[PDB]
Each structure stands twice: as C-alpha cells, then as structure tokens.
Amino acid sequence: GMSQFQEVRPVAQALYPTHPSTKDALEEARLLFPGGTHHDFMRALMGYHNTLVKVMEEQC
C-alpha cells in the first residue's frame, strides 16, 4: 500500500482545483502528465472517474 493516498470522500477537496467540466479537468491533468501514453492516461483518469461515480451512487 502507498500510504500517501488515503480514502477521498465524494466532497470537494481544499487546495486542489475545480474545473468547468470533466473535459477541462482532463485537459489540465494532461498538461501535468504530458508524457506517457493516451491509453495509460485515460486508464488512470477514467479508473478514478468510474470509482468515484460508484462511491457516490452507493452512498445514502
């Protein structure tokens, strides 16, 4: 386990940006991680997307 990563609840997180759209958020993430492949980039980001959608949906 990588202990620098803790569970992030489906609420706004201070000290990190918020973008106009998921499109924009992907654009800005790609600027920070421009090297390495489009495939790996989407796997990383969409894996997070899918996970967060499931977490949000499963709550009450």
Cβ neighbour number for residue 60 with a 10 Å cutoff = 2
Does 1 interact with Cl ion (rule: CB under 5 A)? yes
Q: Are 45 and 29 in contact (CB under 8 A)?
A: yes
**In the complex, least distance from residue 19 CB atom to Cl ion, rounded to whole angstroms:** 14
**In the complex, least distance from residue 39 CB atom to Cl ion, rounded to whole angstroms:** 9
**In the complex, least distance from residue 14 CB atom to Cl ion, rounded to whole angstroms:** 19
Tell me which residues in 13-52 interact with its own copies (CB under 8 A).
13, 15-30, 32-33, 35-36, 38, 40-52
Give me the count of residues in the chain. 60
